[PDB]
Design a protein around this ligand. Structure first.
Ligand code: HEM
Length: 440
């Protein structure tokens, strides 16, 4: 098995000593191929890049989700919520069983009005810009997703479009997330009561609810079919914090990368815009109209192919096994799935992997199993997938309906890395088509 440069007792660690470790890992994957070993003090893992090896890794009888160091740091505030819990923890299966149906495609009909509420606020903000102004894309997309998850999650309004200093909860959460990633002594005091700012607000809202079909309502009314137990108030709080953590920046990034790819590819933009104009015939889009935005959905999947915004997930071997008939693994050995490399597997996608061509997704069932995994794998895959895609499709569709866009700076893609991926600095100008935008 190949391995990049080691640095004594530092091992490969110094190689991640950069702002952009995943893109660095992609270059290593370019050099070393489909699998390479990567070591740090106390650690070892194997990065997989090919559909061939990744399909085996996705076999749930053989491998299960691993809590990476990043997830263990996030667990200090996300607790035993779905995202940061072991599959074998009682609370994982319990919250999973309870929440699954509330995250189905069917369930999206119930969140649609609230999603529309925030989407309309975004579009009006842009309708109301003067000629001398431009849009900060990922910044506005993050306002949108945070507010949407807050509203659909626990019927709470962060009112991010009424501020440029975020609601104190957002500031604390963002601070906490950033601290947890930087760990990979005043920081410690700040971390502790950012945690406290988060728990305080969420606990309060839960307590107030005690004395509407959103999520929180589902969680207060849910019983796990296996045990017959409901979730306790502490876990509910962790789940709420979890939806925000896992959902806000992944989804914001997707919207940002899609708009980036659209303005860099005017022919696709025009085709996407034509669909939006034909489909979204009402001042407020309906749930069914969003489902008819087929090409918009393809644009989104092709953005996730090139830059999956949660670009790596970790697995461990349940038992001794041999990977791909050539790499023996022991129980507990770790693997990392490098999603952006998987999505550039020429043997699956053809040689033009770097090109933005949404038409690749014209026939989704033509895509081999485990070739496309922006939402992770199996029972530990993203529970928010339908929610994320419905939000992004609704919002992108509305953007395309209501504005023409100008890449006025000729933006140079600069991909910032945290827990997630984002096109940092991406800005555009939006000229309104002056089309009625209505009462929800
Ligand atoms: C485009 C947007 C999104 C992407 C690309 C994404 C990606 C992912 C990935 C890759 C995982 C697996 C992590 C791992 O295996 O360690 C995951 C898990 C999860 N995500 Fe998403 N996510 C997105 C949006 C959302 C949203 C909007 C929500 C909630 C509203 C959400 C909630 C969760 C939860 C609760 C888990 C843990 C599920 C479990 O293990 O039971 N995500 N996500």
């Amino acid at each position: 098995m190949p391995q990049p440069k080691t640095f004594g007792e530092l091992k490969n660690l110094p190689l991640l000593n950069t702002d952009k470790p995943v893109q660095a890992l992609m270059k290593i994957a370019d050099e070393l191929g489909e699998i390479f070993k990567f070591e740090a003090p106390g650690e070892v893992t194997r990065y997989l890049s090919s559909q061939r090896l990744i399909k085996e890794a996705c076999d749930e009888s053989r491998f299960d989700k691993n809590l990476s160091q990043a997830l263990k740091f996030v667990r200090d505030f996300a607790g035993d919520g779905l995202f940061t819990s072991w599959t074998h923890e009682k609370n994982w299966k319990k919250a999973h069983n309870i929440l699954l149906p509330s995250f189905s495609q069917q369930a999206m009909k119930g969140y649609h009005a609230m999603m529309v509420d925030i989407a309309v606020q975004l579009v009006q903000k842009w309708e109301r810009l003067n000629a001398d102004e431009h849009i900060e894309v990922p910044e506005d997309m993050t306002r949108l997703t945070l507010d949407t998850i807050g509203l659909c999650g626990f019927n709470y309004r962060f009112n991010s479009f009424y501020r440029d200093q975020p609601h104190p909860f957002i500031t604390s959460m963002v601070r906490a997330l950033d601290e947890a990633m930087n760990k990979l002594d005043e920081n410690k005091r700040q971390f502790q009561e950012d945690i406290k700012v988060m728990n305080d607000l969420v606990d309060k809202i839960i307590a107030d609810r005690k004395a509407s079909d959103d999520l929180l309502t589902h969680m207060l009314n849910g019983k796990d079919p296996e045990t017959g137990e409901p979730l306790d108030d502490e876990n509910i709080r962790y789940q709420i914090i979890t939806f925000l953590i896992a959902g806000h920046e992944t989804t914001s990034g997707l919207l940002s990368f899609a708009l980036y790819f659209l303005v860099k590819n005017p022919h696709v933009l025009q085709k996407a815009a034509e669909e939006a104009a034909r489909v979204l015939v009402d001042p407020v889009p309906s749930y069914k109209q969003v489902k008819q935005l087929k090409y918009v959905g393809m644009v989104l999947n092709e953005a996730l192919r090139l830059w999956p915004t949660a670009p790596a997930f970790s697995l461990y071997a349940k038992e001794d096994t041999v990977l791909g008939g050539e790499y023996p693994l022991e129980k507990g050995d770790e693997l990392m799935v490098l999603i952006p490399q998987l999505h550039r597997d020429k043997t699956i996608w053809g040689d033009d992997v770097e090109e933005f061509r949404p038409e690749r997704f014209e026939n989704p069932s033509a895509i081999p199993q485990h070739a496309f995994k922006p939402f992770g794998n199996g029972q530990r895959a993203c529970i928010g997938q339908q929610f994320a895609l419905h939000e992004a499709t609704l919002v992108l569709g509305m953007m395309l309906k209501h504005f023409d866009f100008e890449d006025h700076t000729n933006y140079e893609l600069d991909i910032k890395e945290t827990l997630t991926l984002k096109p940092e600095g991406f800005v555009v100008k939006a000229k309104s088509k002056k089309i009625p935008l209505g009462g929800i």
